[PDB]
Symmetry: C2
Subunit: 149 residues, 2 copies
């Protein structure tokens, strides 16, 4: 809604993405899925760069403290309580789900906010997140499906 609120969301979304992607990179690497690990390093790096841009913008404003559910990635499928996310197919899909949630926040903000800057950044940020979803879709396509057991 407001630009302060929007920038708080954007920073939180990016801080979260950086952490979650490093974590996924680490897991890919540890099981020698080096290509997928690198997709996630790239994404974690984009988070840092983009987050830094948003942080420069936000120096002008007093930002609200957000609640965790406003920005955290959704918890993944809960089996058997603990792995599933160690396979590339499942990590990529998890990452994609949350890329989409971030995209949707940006699109919703750009549509419903009266502040033209929120409209502008929301649209810009949504378009870029959309390119991430498309890129992850291309990966998921080429990624073989694992079997349980």
């Amino acid at each position: 809604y407001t630009l302060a609120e929007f920038l708080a969301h954007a920073i939180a979304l990016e801080t979260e993405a950086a952490e979650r992607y490093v974590e996924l990179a680490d897991m890919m690497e540890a099981h020698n899925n080096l290509d997928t690990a690198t997709v996630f390093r790239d994404m974690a790096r984009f988070s840092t760069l983009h987050g830094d841009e948003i942080k420069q913008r936000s120096r002008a404003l007093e930002l609200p403290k957000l609640m965790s559910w406003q920005y955290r990635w959704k918890t993944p499928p809960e089996v058997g309580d603990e792995h599933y996310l160690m396979t590339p197919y499942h990590a990529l899909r998890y990452a994609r789900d949350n890329e989409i949630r971030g995209m949707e926040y940006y699109k919703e903000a750009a549509a419903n906010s009266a502040d033209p800057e929120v409209k502008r950044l929301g649209a810009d940020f949504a378009a870029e997140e959309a390119e991430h979803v498309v890129a992850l879709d291309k990966w998921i396509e080429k990624t073989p499906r694992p079997s349980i057991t």
Copy 2:
């Protein structure tokens, strides 16, 4: 499983609980649900005290870094994407769900670990988390159910 692993879980569970309870306390207070806010302040305080105990234990060991899904509270019901958790009935049930997940981790560790200390702390910690669930059940009983609209 191992004591290092167990203590890493316990610390993470408590760091997480403290943050989540402060957050819920803040929301209760902000809507003048002062009794429920205080239940959550009490819990956040228990986290700090208990976490500090676990931290003293863990100085003896190199702890593994855990993945977020190993210790984070589950994300709450996702509607309409954003509130629901501002009502006491919904915050208490959310808190209870995650108290139960923590209890279950402790019980599972105590049952499946060969290390007698993990067995001992796991049982001790599970029994106390169980008292928290029972306390939240008593609250949920006395808490009126809200209506949407």
